[PDB]
Amino acid sequence: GDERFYAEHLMPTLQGLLDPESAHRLAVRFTSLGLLPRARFQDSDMLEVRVLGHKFRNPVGIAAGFDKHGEAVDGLYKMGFGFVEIGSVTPKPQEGNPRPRVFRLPEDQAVINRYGFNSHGLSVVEHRLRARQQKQAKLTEDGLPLGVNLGKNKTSVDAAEDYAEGVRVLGPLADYLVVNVSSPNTAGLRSLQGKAELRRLLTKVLQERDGLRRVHRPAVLVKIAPDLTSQDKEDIASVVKELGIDGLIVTNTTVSRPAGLQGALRSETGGLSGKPLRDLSTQTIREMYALTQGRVPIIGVGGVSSGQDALEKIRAGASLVQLYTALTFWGPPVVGKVKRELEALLKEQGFGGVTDAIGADHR
Ligand SMILES: CN(C)CCCCC(=O)Nc1ccc(NC(=S)NC(=O)c2ccc(C(C)(C)C)cc2)cc1
Ligand SMILES: Cc1cc2nc3c(=O)[nH]c(=O)nc-3n(C[C@H](O)[C@H](O)[C@H](O)COP(=O)(O)O)c2cc1C
Ligand SMILES: CCCCCCCCCC[N+](C)(C)[O-]
Ligand SMILES: O=C1C[C@@H](C(=O)O)NC(=O)N1
Ligand SMILES: [Cl-]
């Protein structure tokens, strides 16, 4: 009924009438004022997950990039997400790339973007989160945690120092931080996934995190690309275990263009998201789980539009999942749809809950 309206009428009219950047801004705005259904799906106990030092009422989060500046957090919980990740936030404000910088590939259920870390900056986000800090503390306690994704400024001379500043400023306000070393849209950034660079960077990040007062001390995750070599994945796994990194977000967008893309805009520069990324992301989860012996929580992201999509990532090793791109095509009903289908599939496959399914394919 209501998922059939947004998918076939509203989203085709929103997206047909406005350029994707405009549409996204309007969506942030609407979401932030809480103009959504109100959201009817009541989360089953089957969907609760305990990971990263927190309870998650359900395992479906909004991926980084939808709410870059932390403006819509409460509306995103109201949409039925189990957890919200904001960002990426850069130390200083910066504008990002010139427009157009986001492209829909409706025939692929995909998006390409080259935003380039358009960010209001740490200070503005810090103030926005402080204004609701206690409210968030109650949400977290009730099983609705908040992640903050950190990036780096385009002209920064010292990448590690940018991330460290991010830890110092937003770490105290976050349940988890993400060291986003996987945007395809900032020159040299993905180099920070290499072994020696990554170890030096994360050492410094963890030190900064460790220097925060205990109730303000977040988990630290690293978000990785789907385009890594085997060598690069081996090396990340090694560093993450050596340093005690709390988890991985797997994956960012791809700079690949899988054969079969039909959208006219398929050769635009940027990162590809949505359904052509799905199985590349799933396979990256699968390998990172195996290389970390199932001991390092993974948040699985890339092309999730359904309960099956979510369960494939969980079974491959994700403790939690996120989605973004599906919202472009299905709108807010997709969240309840993913949850309901995931619950039914867990029951069908004989799992007592999401926790029992995590990594099941490896057992
Ligand atoms: C007639 N109306 C519009 C009001 C009707 C009821 C409320 C409502 O529609 N709310 C609402 C809330 C959110 C949305 N859309 C969402 S959540 N997302 C997007 O439209 C969107 C997401 C991502 C992108 C890019 C940047 C990836 C392309 C673009 C749009 C649409 C409608
Ligand atoms: C328009 C857009 C902007 C994004 N911005 C960011 C960001 O700032 N930081 C980040 O770590 N990931 C960013 N992502 C990546 C998503 O968080 C996600 O990793 C990727 O889009 C795969 O999930 P999806 O297929 O469900 O969209 C962005 C994605 C899109 C589509
Ligand atoms: C709020 C003061 C800082 C503004 C700096 C410019 C950041 C551009 C972010 C882009 N946009 C507003 C479209 O999301
Ligand atoms: O991490 C990121 C950053 C983003 C951008 O261009 O800002 N685009 C992405 O696809 N991933
Ligand atoms: Cl082409």
Residue numbers in the entry: 33 to 395
The publication says:
These mechanisms are the inhibition of a key enzyme of the de novo pyrimidine synthesis pathway, dihydroorotate dehydrogenase (DHODH), and the blockage of uridine transport into cells. The blockage of DHODH by another chemical class adds to our previous findings that DHODH is a frequently hit target of small molecules.
We used an enzyme activity assay to assess the effect of tenovins on DHODH enzymatic activity. This assay revealed that a number of tenovin analogues are capable of inhibiting DHODH (IC50 shown in Fig. 1B and Fig. S2). We finally obtained a crystal structure of tenovin 6 co-crystallized with DHODH. Based on the crystal structure of tenovin 6 co-crystallized with DHODH, we decided to model the potential interactions of the tenovins with DHODH to examine the energetic favorability of the interaction. Our structural models were constructed using the apo-structure of DHODH and refined using extensive molecular dynamics (MD) simulations. Now it has been established that tenovin 6 has two additional mechanisms of action, DHODH inhibition and blockage of uridine uptake, along with the previously established targets SirT1 and SirT2 (11) as well as blockage of autophagic flux.
